[PDB]
Amino acid sequence: ELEKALSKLSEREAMVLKMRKGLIDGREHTLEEVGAYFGVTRERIRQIENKALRKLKYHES
């Protein structure tokens, strides 16, 4: 997919997405694992992920 959408994603968003989806170490991480990873709440990670996904939906149009 490279960019052209992943390009519009911020650094936090791209990183949260890759860790969550298994794109970093080939393993999917829970919201809690990612929150503890960066030191933020489960909910904050959900918020960043949902926003990243909405941005991907936009640039797929």
Please name each of the domains of the chain with its CATH number. 1-61 (1.10.10.10)
Technique used to solve these coordinates? X-ray
What is the three-class DSSP state of 6? coil
Resolution of the structure, angstroms: 1.8
Single out the residue of 45, 60, 46, 44 nearest to residue 8, CA to CA. Answer: 60
Using an 8 Å Cβ cutoff, are 34 and 20 in contact?
yes
- CA–CA distance, 16 with 9 (Å, rounded to integer): 10
- Taking the C-alpha atoms of residue 34 and residue 1, their distance in angstroms, rounded to an integer, is 23
* CA 40 – CA 55 distance, rounded (Å): 21
Q: What is the radius of gyration, based on Cα positions, of the chain?
A: 11
